[PDB]
């Protein structure tokens, strides 16, 4: 498919959080064709929290093609300013070399290959060029390009969140055990509320949010959070395993 | 048959999604002869999301012949501009060589053979020529041509989605496991709602949309989605197997 | 028909507004033959707002032929001055070449063809010549000429409102969202007042005129009008859809 | 359209306030053709509050063309003095270069293009020239010019209200929170009075005008207005959201 | 906006009290355009209580431009005498340097910038110069100047009410607790009288005006007013919180 190969190369560049859980409803209802509007979506996406201007741009290049109409309205400025890359003079023709190449392709992987064998930042300049003409580059090709633009990025993270240096301090490794549990427990309040019982594991999750409120409220020793996530899951490995979704995945 | 050999060569060029699930209702109700209009259909098809201008053209060449009347109205422009191919001077006569050949045939496969033994892009120029005269080429022949025009395309994809290069990153292979499940689970909410129970597998599918909302909401590790689609199907391999449609097909 | 092929080639040259909604009642009641007078109509048409002197002329050449009598009164001057084209010496005979050609035809499309294969401005000189003799050119032929004179114009706009350059500023794209809604909402006050309820959507439309009065009265940010028309229609997609006319056409 | 592309390029140069909410009723009833007079309108527009003499001039060049008659009365002086630009000798011919160019055009965007590729202040000199002859420049062309004259202005603001330097003082940032709320609350008294209840949110808005009267009456600390607009909207996000217009737009 | 950026730079220079609560109704009804007169307003503003002659002048320079007419009457003398600054010979040309600069600008922030990069008292001399000619300085520019003139002032206070030296005496810190409460309680009598109950918190506020009358009537010890404001608010944190405006803002 082609729409389950674009959300994948688009949702993998966004940080993890309720932003990515909302965007993935907009992208969903955009493809399906619900009653939606663009300038609503582009304003909601310009005010946003943490998001690279490049990443606010790609999602503007996406929602402008996918939407059920050819509005052709004022090409919004946060995108056109985002995809130039602060005007690098050394790729103005390189993008045009690519824009004139991609004008010839008709399939998806034909473009993603050509665009991968290319720089990691001049692709945006082509995307900011297609965001001004969009005349002979069909949308399948363009999705081949953003899937390359966003794969050069996703590899930038995979070479980063693997080259990390884990922490030695206990204070920080105490809070990480509290965050993960207080976070994981807030989800389980939601994953259960849409179920039939919603009364045995909504509580087992709430108290592990209270117990974490207490440690911060008491100044407890960092040797107390040890085994807090995995001890939460075990207590609702019965209710929220078959009367819920599943477990041994959140850890 | 002849109408179950035209939807096949027309629905195989369109990307996969709710577009193709809607088009295949328009093509259905067009052949059957329900109360339908053309300029409605041609406007709805001009505003559309991802679709090659060539592919917006073929479907205009189809719906103009299949519709229960000979309107002969203004030959809409997105088609006539789409099927010329940006005016290639090297096939103006080659199409006319074909247009004068196809004028002689009376059967379907007689045209699809002749049109296959020919270029992959000059066929459109003939189709844009039949879209201006349509005088001695019966509709059976024309359907022989679009079935060739769209088989040269469907082979272009089969030589593309087989020459692909699978991904190595886990972030991207984490999202693909979320998309496929969140997508597959949205269908099962629909394939069940038209059934008698609609209450055991509509939930088993909804929670696997919630559990996927949680991972994005938590930033879970990419080793958690492993076995999420096939683990969904197993939990409604009982309800949505005999009280539904069938399974072990979606994977 | 012949009168539904003259209002079409005459109402397509007039700008959009209450002028065109009034003219199309005069042209209607002229053909039907209601109790009407000419010099009333020609005075009302000389004082008018935005209208090309050429376009004030064609409508004088129309209403003078269509009216239920052969007055033959003083050929009013705003027309005769409008159709000469500021006295081009290079078409005085070309029009007379056409006036002597059109004297031979008896059908409509026979004239519209001959007059199309001709200049875009010497046609008026023929029309200003027929506006002085009108002796052997039957009215069917003359309507063949104005339908050509006004098709050379309507193509001038189609090559203009398609070659436009959309706006980038938000202030201007903020007001356009206010105009379209405040305009569209004034119509819906009228399209509902001639109905049975006239009380649920007359209000839903009035408040969206008040909310737009407020933004101008407050100096609101240009990211507030986003989704104002389409948000209006949705709120009276229930009342003014079946207890009214129809929708999803105004957008 | 052409009248929804003139109010947009005319209402975007006027400051925000009840002036712009009144002008946009005059421009509305002028196009529609209600019983209106010019010298009333030109006197009402000469006495006015804050408005650039240039901006008082453009609206005189507009209302003189749009009005349902060709009065041709004494060309009022606040316009003719406004559009010369204090007699710049370096554009007397440049305007005449433009006046002789625009005499040839028949469409709208043909003029707006030509007039954009030109100075930002010599356009007025052409407009003050058309305000003295108005002989071969049709009104469509002239509206193409004011839409350019007023786009050179609207870009002057967009390069100004974006280059602003936000305030650091709390006293000033205390009053801005009071103005916006006391202003926004006065509108909501009006947007509700034309509704059925007009009794739950007319009060919720009035008290937030009283609470702001109190701070000025008490000399309250600048850390009290923090969250006053958005706290107002929340209290009538129930009444004045569906029994009114809409919200989350005024902020 | 431009009128919600002038009341802010004008109401921030006036002391806090019923003066500022009245002025902010005059400025409001001036912009909106109610039936108002100038010489009424300028007399009411000349007799006034505490107000710097400079501050009585700026508000005369404001109300003279904002008012719906061009009276051009006798330039009232309390302004013209106020804005010269007791005739400083060392800025007669500096203002004229500014008056000739500001004659060139057309936008607001363009003037406020230029006028900020300038003295804190020669701005008035320019304002007293514009109060005599007002010929080529549009009102938008002038409002750019008073917004600078009054920002040099508002910073003078922010460098004053922050450099204060708090009091050590208890007698004075006893009365301040009585004033704030007796003042705050008089407002709450008003903020409640425009509500539905006006009977539970109008009394809770009146008695805290009586209890303060008693201390003055008894000569009570300064350790009795401690916790009088915050103890008042708590007793009508129920009535005058949802059946009123809001609280925890007055402290």
Author numbering:
A (entry chain C), B (entry chain C), C (entry chain C), D (entry chain C), E (entry chain C): 2 to 252
Q: What do the authors say?
A:
The matrix protein M1 is one of the most abundant and most highly conserved proteins of IAV. It is a small, 252-amino–acid protein composed of an α-helical N-terminal domain (NTD) and a C-terminal domain (CTD). Ultrastructural analysis has revealed that the matrix shell within intact virions is formed by a single-helical layer of M1 that is closely associated with the viral membrane. Here, we show that recombinant, soluble full-length M1 from IAV can assemble into 2 different oligomeric forms.
Mutation of V97 to a lysine, predicted to disrupt hydrophobic interactions at either of the C2-symmetry and lateral interfaces observed by crystallography, led to the formation of single-layered oligomers. The M1-V97K oligomers are similar to the matrix layers observed in intact virions, which are also formed by a single-helical layer of M1. We observed relatively straight M1-V97K tubes in vitreous ice and determined a 3.4-Å cryo-EM map. The M1-V97K oligomer is a hollow tube assembled from approximately 21 asymmetric units per helical turn, with inner and outer diameters of 124 Å and 248 Å and a helical pitch of 42 Å. The structure of its NTD contains 9 α-helices (α1–α9) and is identical to the previously solved crystal structure. The CTD forms a helical bundle comprising 3 α-helices (α10–α12) that connect to the NTD within the same molecule via extended connecting loop 9 (CL9). Individual M1-V97K proteins are assembled with their NTDs skewed toward the outside and their CTDs toward the inside of the helical tube. Within each strand, M1 subunits interact via the stacked interface observed in the crystal structures of NTDM1. Interactions between the strands are formed between the CTDs of the lower strand and NTDs of the strand above: for example, between the CTD of N and the NTD of N + 23. At the interface of 3 adjacent subunits, all 5 histidine residues found in the M1 sequence form a cluster.
